[PDB]
Amino acid sequence: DFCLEPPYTGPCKARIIRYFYNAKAGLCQTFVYGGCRAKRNNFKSAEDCMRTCGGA
């Protein structure tokens, strides 16, 4: 799953911030994206982030 899982920023993440849903916070917080790591749990828009991960 890619809704309640934490970001995989690791030791690689340039100057391109994105969004991820923090199941403990209640919304999709802004975090950067990397070209060296890059995984599935990553959303560019908060709308598609909460809609694809959550829904309500």
Side-chain angles (χ1 to χ4, degrees):
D1 56 299
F2 45 55
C3 182
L4 54 84
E5 293 290 0
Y8 185 48
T9 310
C12 238
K13 238 77 175 288
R15 64 273 104 171
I16 306 154
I17 309 86
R18 233 182 180 181
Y19 293 64
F20 86 96
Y21 196 103
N22 319 44
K24 293 285 180 180
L27 49 295
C28 291
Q29 197 71 61
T30 54
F31 85 105
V32 191
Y33 187 66
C36 357
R37 294 285 180 180
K39 241 284 180 180
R40 296 180 292 180
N41 187 161
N42 299 67
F43 286 79
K44 196 74 79 67
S45 300
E47 292 77 7
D48 294 299
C49 176
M50 288 180 73
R51 206 278 180 180
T52 310
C53 123

